[PDB]
Ligand SMILES: Nc1ncnc2c1ncn2[C@@H]1O[C@H](COP(=O)(O)OP(=O)(O)OP(=O)(O)O)[C@@H](O)[C@H]1O
Ligand SMILES: Nc1ncnc2c1ncn2[C@@H]1O[C@H](COP(=O)(O)OP(=O)(O)OP(=O)(O)O)[C@@H](O)[C@H]1O
Ligand SMILES: [Mg+2]
């Protein structure tokens with residue numbers, strides 16, 4: 172094929188339950204219904220890549236358990252067609268998962284179990300695992316696995332001359348400078364970028380400031396995701412390249428939007444498209460994603476994205 | 484060959500997460516860890532019967548999802564040994580599951596998605612479905628599937644002349660008198676016994692009276708589970724049979740204890756043991772269960788229950 176997309180990151184079973192009200196301590200309650208879906212930022216991103224018919228590997232850790240089974244079925248040969256060669260299962264950790272309680276009062280409460288995502292990685296990455304990233308077209312990371320692993324990968328590929336994108340989605344802790352210095356492109360939303368720099372982000376102006384602070388701390392490029400306001404690519408060798416939303420006829424479910432945006436973006440970039448094309452390819456993919464319910468369910472095939480890009 | 488134990492009931496993925504406290508509205512907390520296990524009272528009871536080497540069939544409804552395959556894997560040919568011939572899966576409902584939140588404060592909170600357990604049954608059972616209960620040597624029911632399905636099954640066996648046990652475990656709702664009328668043995672714990680009859684159960688005299696009230700509701704035999712106090716078989720017009728606990732060296736995890744007790748009782752009964760032998764064999768099996776974590780994983784094999792019986796006559 173071509174030099175693959177390599178996503179190193181998280182895979183989660185998302186367990187949604189529709190509840191009237193969170194139960195009281197001691198109390199047992201019933202849900203209207205519930206559905207358990209393959210999810211996690213790394214898996215979403217890898218799934219998106221494989222749907223865009225680009226060669227895509229996922230490097231991650233699962234428990235040897237039902238949720239583990241659920242993730243591989245969804246990403247693999249019977250699903251999105253991600254290469255799972257570098258996924259390892261372990262027997263002493265649960266597959267990561269999240270209990271998403273959708274309360275009837277409009278509210279939503281969440282419990283997260285890092286499980287294998289956080290606890291099943293080696294102290295030192297294997298040479299096998301480093302072999303796939305050193306052979307990668309582009310590497311995608313997030314923050315739902317330990318920074319230590321993110322750093323080891325980023326260093327391996329920096330040596331190799333392979334571009335690495337770090338999505339900031341994940342743990343609400345500061346990013347290690349040694350990680351910030353090894354990545355090519357940092358990719359926050361307005362919220363993340365804000366809590367990242369301690370600076371406000373309600374205007375393009377003050378957003379552009381926090382990005383300066385990011386540039387200052389060793390980050391050559393910031394791909395900011397701005398929800399309904401579109402998105403901007405800041406290169407600290409230029410001024411922000413911008414791209415707004417491709418409007419969606421119906422917006423049912425924004426879940427998966429950011430992951431789709433980032434993966435789509437990364438696929439265009441390894442297909443050697445230009446920055447403007449990259450942004451629009453990603454904007455188109457995300458647009459199609461928010462028109463369907465579910466994250467991995469909603470992700471567009473390449474044909475659908477190319478068809479939409481035809482419009483002016 | 485031997486007329487099978489036949490269990491009709493629930494199958495759940497039990498999703499356990501360890502948290503310091505419950506979250507607030509909007510709040511995303513982090514659990515310490517988690518584990519998903521095959522459970523549900525029906526699957527537990529089936530698995531327990533299979534592990535005791537009595538031919539066991541499980542009748543239930545799964546979704547065609549991962550949780551579904553987890554159940555089948557645990558119960559089936561490569562697992563406990565339950566015949567699954569009569570398990571049916573549907574595409575329009577998920578396998579039942581339960582989110583169990585183990586708090587740091589000892590408090591537990593549960594969220595139950597009934598799923599296929601409650602929504603994948605026909606309005607009317609097929610003769611295909613009821614053929615197995617008509618050939619049972621004994622039938623066990625619980626209250627984690629629709630009352631209406633419990634009723635059709637129990638009636639089909641009353642016409643067949645085979646003993647039906649109803650575990651009160653599950654829904655905390657009143658029991659349809661039609662159901663009560665068609666079962667041979669009711670099996671509540673003391674908390675269930677109270678809620679059911681409406682009577683208090685703090686003392687044995689009180690319990691004996693709440694059982695008199697079960698007797699007035701159409702059930703000739705009541706098998707009361709009294710936790711660490713033991714158990715008792717009440718048979719209308721006869722002297723109650725009492726059985727204390729068989730002490731466990733280590734109470735690790737009482738999950739599945741009541742299910743083990745009831746299924747073990749059933750196996751001893753359909754094999755023709757005396758009431759006292761049934762109660763004792765059920766007490767021994769439940770004793771072993773509480774010494775291992777998990778429900779289905781802690782279920783003892785026959786030779787161990789019998790061994791614990793020698794050394795604690
Ligand atoms: N209402 C919308 N209509 C069309 N496209 C949208 C809409 N909202 C978001 N998008 C697309 O999705 C992209 C990413 O969304 P957003 O900036 O919210 O990412 P995020 O907050 O990281 O998402 P997530 O919550 O999924 O992690 C946006 O840049 C935009 O192109
Ligand atoms: N600590 C213990 N030591 C030994 N045996 C025990 C212990 N706790 C329970 N058992 C056995 O388990 C049986 C059933 O327990 P219990 O009456 O609490 O069931 P239950 O409340 O229906 O259980 P569950 O909550 O699992 O549905 C008891 O009668 C007893 O024989
Ligand atoms: Mg957003």
Ligand SMILES: [Mg+2]
Pocket residue numbers: 340360429430
């Ligand atoms: Mg995001």
Ligand SMILES: [Mg+2]
Pocket residue numbers: 672710
């Ligand atoms: Mg009890």
Ligand SMILES: [Mg+2]
Pocket residue numbers: 650652672741742
């Ligand atoms: Mg019970």
Ligand code: NA
Pocket residue numbers: 424425426427428460461462463464465466469
């Ligand atoms: Na979506």
Ligand code: NA
Pocket residue numbers: 736737738739740772773774775776777778781
């Ligand atoms: Na146990």
